[PDB]
């Protein structure tokens, strides 16, 4: 009995545990003067379900097509309307049965004709820079092999399969193989030919290959420059020029350049060279720069460097794994323009022209091979690929093509094996084949803690108080004692920290004081760079983000794929303003008497001479002097103390008490950069003299009473619910008290540790917050001054089931227009809810005002949102927005926009202006309900009802990063206590 | 300062803790001839949200009223439109500040106007027999009272206030008092005046309240007779008429009736009686049993009973807690008519009119205070009402007007003091009154299990195992050894038990046999006897019921209050059926060779002369014998062998072998009765003839290939997927293994004991049994017999993520007209998830066929569904429905309607039919898939895609009763495990 199964041949190539074969070898992406057609365009595409139902027309011929349609390469063909995008973060959307693949694997058949002239003879090849999963290449009906490694760059002789004049490329791709077990990073899956496809000619006597080695001698200022060709595997004889050092050398042979300008992410500079044969010249970018590592500390060019890092994923709303080059450049000077410096190429190589970019712009790249096998944690590494013999070659060979493509660019200054795949012999051959291969550049890998295989110390996630043990050199010992004195002899690294998931990261400041005070820590790179949100239409037409589950998954992981400091579009998230603040190179302290500010160069190679001083007195009339200062320049990782001009310090002492006034210090560039323009805003600092505390109103006006209402002055009170139903004319819906906010992406995560594990989310809904309800417990006025009164509602808010509550009450005066208004919160019971104490998001009031509010000003921290462990990007002044821009478009519409440090905000109420005043409290103004918001999904469904719903707070809870990793901080909790504020009120024209 | 706030005089009396004011002294319910005038009809009704806005505009005078409209009283108002009716189960619906009232307090004011004829004066009062939770009365604008206890009587005396001619009764009702915190029951909450408002005349020289005491002497069969009158609280002269049993004497003596025969639930002997003063009379109904406890045995009459009981709640899907009357006895003869003899009325006494039905029809009753302080429990009892010494008057005067209204009726054998109202010295008080009080009843109470304060020891949902160790007295000591001692002392009764939520419930075989094998075991009352359904229409007009949560309910405990063994209208569930089955009082064993049957008399007075003995054969073609054989009547608790006709067991000898026949012999009425006409069915038993293992096809037919298919004989496969895509020209859409479920309500509970508490539906959607995906691992054709070959087609089922699974073989073999289908399971790694073995729903197929069933037929067991732990009313025999009705219409859609025990089913698809065989299999046929079952939150969602979905399960796991009580006992748990199972198939005409 025969097998009678259909596709049986296919999937077992499919299955199969090798690399793609029929491919030259791996080697450097370079810059040859070879003639060069890239093959990009409209191809014809067709799709089939699975491997058994593909047809076997000889469609590769090109001829009699049957169902294909035109369709761009490169692209990733889910984002074209070919099937759909499906998101999981560690779950693999498919049975875990190394090396089977499910039946349902879509197929798409690519096929493009072209033109071949007579430049591309005798010799000649393909190039496909990016296939996810698994391609089969036939040129004119001929295989010419098959592709693994969905990130990685491949090769084929077309040497006598090219015909000139016309020929016929076609690429059959499996979205799901036995790759797909080794490619299992937290993304959306994505078949298809996402990268270029070049044909290249291969004239003889030309450069194959090319390995740049530029090392930097700190003491001497020395370059050691060899640079090495070779073709067909060989090393040939070639002449190597670099014009700008004035030297000519053979290819193959170290020289020692006398004096060259380091290259680092501060200072990028860059040597034109080209080396060349008789029959091609190869354009190289050379860098020089030397990576050690000695004392426990990763040093570039003889210094300890910090990191300021992120994870930079390649995704587009819109193109899916197809990152315009133009949105690339973009990005890349948005990252310098909030002082970022280094980048993960979070989990595989990036598009290899990215690699000069970062080159020239300046940043340290963490360069990561295309592996993860994280869906296997779950099994116990069960069957893990990096430690099964039979993967060996197939991951090697990852890291081969990987290590090859890349090696020239000074900007590489650590290889990474992967990301989350666990241990194994196979991580530990990747790790052999590069220190051999490649010894100028440490190796990097997290997932095995023991730090066997690498050269740095990495963690992702590791709490503050972790890494402040490890940064001392504290941690406790490995079981190995000569692992354990390896590794403590390692510099740290966190790979990945502060996720910036949502409404957040909080506790970066806690991280960064870290960095700065132990050498041993490395820095961190924050997970993550961008949201991968992919743009969806409504019904109506109108555009939003959407993210997992709203594609149809059977499985996925919801809006954890929108977790970055950017959105997909690149629009900054108020995480990246804060980041921007937290990373600053320079600190700027400016002196409580204005009389100058002490100036601390924090880079690690240059000096203050880039930038250039500003000083501005800012005050409610708004500026009152400024201008610059001249600072001698700042060694790196030196201060100074930098006077101010007399005038600033004579204004400040001049100030009658009470009145508020800023002083801000910037550090602007002096001149235009390759990142930003003159003027772009680097660091700063600030002192402040606070507006003194709001005097309340006297009581001079009396309670009037009738049947069914109170007056008093300009508010009229109900007098069954006790609460106002007018402040000025300004109609109030509803006053209470609230303790809730719509939770947050982290507040939805779980909190580790302890016997309780629910969200904090979830701790609220189960304690009622959420739903919480007043009782009115009386109403009386009292003698205030010469004939007027206060009037006292005393409440007890709790909610229904529960015996805990809290006690309020709100004393009311006023003198005609200003309305005074003191809150005291008492705790009634114990707040303790399923044997696990409750914690409080808030203790504000809510306003529910019955018209729009259009524009909302305050003076405080700004323009940007605040939470007691954010906010650092905020700074003092006065602000002013529209409502709509008071709110932060975060893809799960959440908790955020809260002004924390206010201490003065105006609404304008169409012809009328709210003016509320108070010590320090934090201002949220929405248009829509928290309700609302908490049950909305995405942006559309948030809708204004009419009103304007104010948030006065008198304490905030922090946001942590719970979603992933630490949760609030101890000082940023916030528990049941009582509390006492006061506010001042007061209705205009 | 004065205060300010309104109501605060209304407020106040709804706070208080005492009892009802101005009310005349509790007493019975008494049929009497004075004059009586129903005040029932069309009220006048105004609704406010609470009291501080509820007018005082003189309505109590019934002139210009405004905002009032007609209601009928009585009535609970939510079921008219006014507000909404409003569920939660332990949680309080207000936060919890005992005895504050939320200000949010729906206000009902009442009003009707009537004649009072001369016959009503001097004397007469107002009698209100239920007000749902605090009412304020005014006759003519004068206060009479107040009313506190919702279910309970209050009645007012209205001499010098009711004038001649027109009178205008006002009452004011609000849905929230202290009160509420004493009555959380588990039902919706429903104010109104839902009970009868009566007038009625208090002639001179009259009868207010009467004491029968009608005890039995079993040994002498002598009848202990007293009958106390009373008139202003005092004993008075009256005479006594008995006629039936020929005695007058005087009300207070004590007599000795020579021969009684005594009442019990069995036999409900009745005499009539009259006492009678000058001024009235008063008819009464006399039963003569008396209650004895000893050696740990509940005894009536001098026999240990066994109590067969259901919680009879009041509700009416449309009028909410009014009951009508026709309901009432409709329902009680459906208890009788599945041998329930006891009721338990759950939490609170019912309408008064319920104890003359129970007395005449015949129950045990355990008539029940109103008194649950639940939703204190999750405080720790803090602040519980029972301990609380300012409720003891409030809870004494509950268990007062409960006592004193029911204590005349026989039906009535124990007296409880509530349910889940934890411990406390009110509770104690209320024993200690009830004792002294009325000594001739037993008192009830499971909230305190040291039994302190009662007279027997009762729990609820206690397991079977623990059942079986109370049953043998070697339960563990209670700290206390005098306490220990009087409970050991005591009889064990489940005061609730096999909650009968949704699917199911299972395991009550395993009680019923220790409550017949432990003569300390009362019995048990199930846990529910009717749904709470509340009749709802959709947009287009359709009915369907509505739970918790269809009203808008911010707290609400969803479909909880669905949890009866009827629907709301009384619709049987398939629970009831085999609760029938499990309790029925005779026990009929048929011999194996059908030579006769073992008949034992379960019941504790009565013998078998009742009952006619009726045998029945039955094969395929229909009928072969029957008729009816003569029983010498045996006594309660014996047993007899009764020979059957000799041509019954002739018959079965000359069956051929493999032929199926069911001997089944019954237990009927033989005369009509109160409940039930002749022939009504009580008990029955089963001797089967199986039907021989069928005979697999020959494999003479062969396998023809195909590009894209495959055919044998009638079947034709997909090549690529190996599936069958038609049997006989029925288009088979899917078929593929099972091992899931739509979770029934028992499977969303949580299953108690162990690290794993996950509800068992969480433990399935985590381990991806919902998700199942296939992978085809080969096809191939095999020798068969003379040409013929057999397709085996080798598949491997798991889920996404998952890396265990199950290897599944399908082995097709043909003759031309039957199909042989061979399934084989072999486990592939261990079925574990999160820690923790996963457990399966089932082993079996699903087939999808791409047309509708009009009709499904099957021999096994039926007409209703069975599953391994329940099904004991379904018996032996052929069945036949359509489509429609194989499902079961439980409120939230769940897995249900599967005929377990099945040996043949013809499904009939338009013009062809479908016979499936095999051995013991289950079958389930469905016009919609699972998904859309597990999906749909209520009846319309379900709905029909053309499809058949055809389950045929190989085993099946219990459903146990894990909603609340016990789980699926371990002998019905499915742990997954290799199967192997064979089925023909063969399509008709
Ligand atoms: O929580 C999972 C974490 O694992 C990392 O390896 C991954 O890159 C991110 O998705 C991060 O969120
Ligand atoms: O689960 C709670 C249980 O508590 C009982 O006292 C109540 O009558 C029922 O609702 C039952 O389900
Ligand atoms: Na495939
Ligand atoms: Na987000
Ligand atoms: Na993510
Ligand atoms: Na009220
Ligand atoms: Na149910
Ligand atoms: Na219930």
Redesign the pocket.
Request: charged content about 25%; some cysteine; proline content about 0%.
């Given at each position: 009995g025969r097998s009678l199964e259909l596709g049986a041949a296919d999937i077992q190539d499919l299955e199969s545990f090798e690399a793609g074969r029929g491919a030259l070898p791996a080697r450097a992406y370079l810059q040859s003067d070879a003639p060069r057609l890239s093959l990009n365009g409209e191809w014809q595409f067709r799709l089939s379900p699975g491997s058994r139902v593909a047809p076997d027309d000889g469609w590769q011929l090109g001829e009699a097509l049957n169902g294909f349609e035109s369709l761009p390469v490169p692209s990733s063909w889910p984002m074209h309307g070919h099937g759909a995008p499906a998101y999981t973060?560690?779950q693999f959307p498919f049975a875990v049965e190394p090396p089977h693949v499910p039946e349902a694997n879509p197929i798409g058949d690519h096929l493009v004709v072209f033109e071949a002239g007579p430049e591309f003879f005798p010799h000649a090849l393909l190039r496909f820079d990016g296939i996810e999963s698994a391609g089969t290449v036939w040129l004119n009906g001929v295989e010419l092999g098959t592709t693994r490694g969905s990130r990685l760059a491949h090769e084929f002789d077309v040497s006598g399969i090219l015909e000139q004049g016309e020929n016929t490329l076609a690429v059959r791709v499996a979205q799901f193989s036995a790759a797909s077990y080794v490619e299992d990073?937290?993304m959306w899956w994505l078949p298809g030919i996402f990268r270029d496809v070049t044909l290249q000619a291969r004239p003889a006597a030309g450069i194959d290959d090319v390995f740049v080695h530029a090392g930097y001698d700190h003491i001497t200022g020395e370059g050691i420059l060899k640079v090495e060709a070779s073709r067909g595997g060989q090393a040939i004889d070639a002449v190597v020029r670099v014009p700008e050092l004035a030297l000519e050398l053979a290819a193959g042979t170290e020289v020692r350049v006398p004096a060259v300008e380091p290259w680092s992410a501060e200072v990028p500079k860059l040597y034109e060279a080209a080396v060349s044969a008789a029959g091609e010249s190869v354009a190289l970018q050379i860098g020089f720069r030397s990576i050690a590592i000695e004392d426990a500390q990763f040093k570039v060019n003889g210094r300890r460097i910090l990191l300021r890092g992120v994870?930079r994923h390649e995704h587009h709303p819109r193109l899916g794994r197809v990152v315009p080059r133009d949105v690339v450049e973009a990005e890349l000077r948005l990252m310098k323009q909030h002082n970022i410096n280094a980048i993960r190429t979070?989990?595989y190589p990036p598009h290899p022209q990215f690699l000069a970019l970062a080159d020239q712009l300046g940043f340290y790249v963490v360069l990561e091979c295309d592996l993860e096998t994280?869906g296997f944690e779950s099994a116990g590494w069960a069957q893990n690929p990096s430690d099964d013999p039979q993967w060996e070659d197939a991951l090697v060979d990852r890291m081969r093509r990987t290590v090859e493509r890349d090696k020239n660019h000074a900007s590489v200054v650590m290889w990474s094996l992967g990301?989350?795949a666990g241990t194994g012999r196979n991580l530990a051959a990747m790790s052999r084949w590069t220190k051999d291969r490649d010894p100028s550049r440490p190796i990097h890998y997290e997932g095995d803690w023991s730090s066997e295989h690498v050269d740095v110390y990495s963690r992702?996630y590791a709490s503050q108080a972790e890494t402040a043990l490890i940064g001392q050199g504290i941690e406790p010992a490995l079981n190995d004692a000569a692992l354990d004195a390896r590794r403590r002899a390692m510099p740290f690294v966190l790979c990945?920290y502060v996720?910036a998931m949502g409404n957040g990261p909080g506790g970066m400041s806690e991280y960064q004081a870290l960095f700065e005070k132990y050498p041993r820590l490395m820095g961190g790179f924050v997970?993550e760079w961008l949201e991968h949100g992919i743009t969806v239409s409504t019904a109506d037409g109108v555009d939003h983000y959407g993210y997992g589950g709203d594609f149809g998954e059977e499985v996925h992981d919801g809006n954890?794929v929108t977790?970055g400091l950017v959105d997909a579009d690149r629009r900054p998230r108020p995480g990246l303003l804060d980041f921007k603040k937290v990373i600053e190179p320079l600190r700027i302290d400016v002196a409580r008497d204005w009389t100058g500010f002490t100036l601390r160069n924090g880079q690690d190679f240059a000096d203050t001479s880039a930038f250039s001083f500003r000083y501005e007195v800012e005050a409610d009339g708004g500026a009152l002097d400024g201008g610059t200062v001249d600072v001698a320049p700042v060694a790196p990782q030196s201060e100074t103390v930098v006077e101010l001009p007399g005038s600033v310090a004579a204004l400040a002492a001049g100030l009658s008490d009470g009145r508020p006034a800023v002083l801000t210090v910037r550090a602007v560039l002096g001149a235009d950069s390759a990142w930003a323009d003159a003027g772009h805003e680097v660091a700063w600092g600030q002192s402040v003299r606070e507006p003194g505390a709001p005097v309340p109103p006297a009581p001079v006006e009396p309670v009037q009473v009738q049947d069914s209402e109170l007056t008093l002055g300009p508010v009229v009170f109900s007098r069954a619910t006790g609460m106002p139903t007018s402040i000025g004319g300004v109609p109030v819906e509803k006053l209470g008290l609230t303790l809730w906010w719509a939770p947050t992406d982290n507040d939805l995560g779980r909190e580790w540790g302890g016997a309780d594990e629910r969200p904090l989310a979830t701790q609220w809904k189960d304690a009622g917050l959420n739903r919480l309800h007043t009782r009115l417990l009386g109403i009386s006025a009292n003698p205030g001054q010469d004939g007027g009164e206060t009037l006292t509602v005393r409440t007890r808010v709790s909610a229904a089931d529960k015996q805990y509550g809290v006690l309020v009450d709100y004393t009311w005066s006023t003198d005609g227009e200003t309305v005074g208004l003191r809150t005291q919160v008492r705790r009634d019971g114990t707040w303790v809810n399923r044997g696990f104490e409750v914690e409080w998001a808030r203790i504000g009031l809510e306003f529910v005002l019955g018209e729009e509010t259009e524009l909302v000003s305050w003076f405080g921290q700004g323009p940007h949102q605040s939470y007691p462990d954010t906010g650092q990007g905020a700074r003092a002044g006065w602000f002013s927005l529209p409502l709509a821009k008071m709110d932060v478009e975060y893809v799960r519409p959440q908790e955020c926009g809260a002004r924390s440090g206010s201490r003065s905000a105006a609404l304008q109420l169409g012809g009328r202006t709210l003016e509320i005043c108070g010590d320090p409290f934090a201002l949220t103004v929405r248009p829509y309900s928290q309700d609302v918001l908490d049950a909305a999904a995405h942006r559309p469904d948030l809708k204004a009802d009419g009103r304007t719903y104010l948030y006065v707070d008198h304490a905030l809870r922090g946001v942590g990063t719970a979603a992933?990793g630490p949760g609030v901080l101890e000082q940023y909790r916030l528990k049941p206590r009582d509390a006492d504020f006061i506010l001042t009120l007061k209705v205009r024209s």
């Open positions: 973060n560690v990073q937290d994870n979070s989990h994280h990301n989350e992702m990945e996720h997970w954890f977790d992933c």
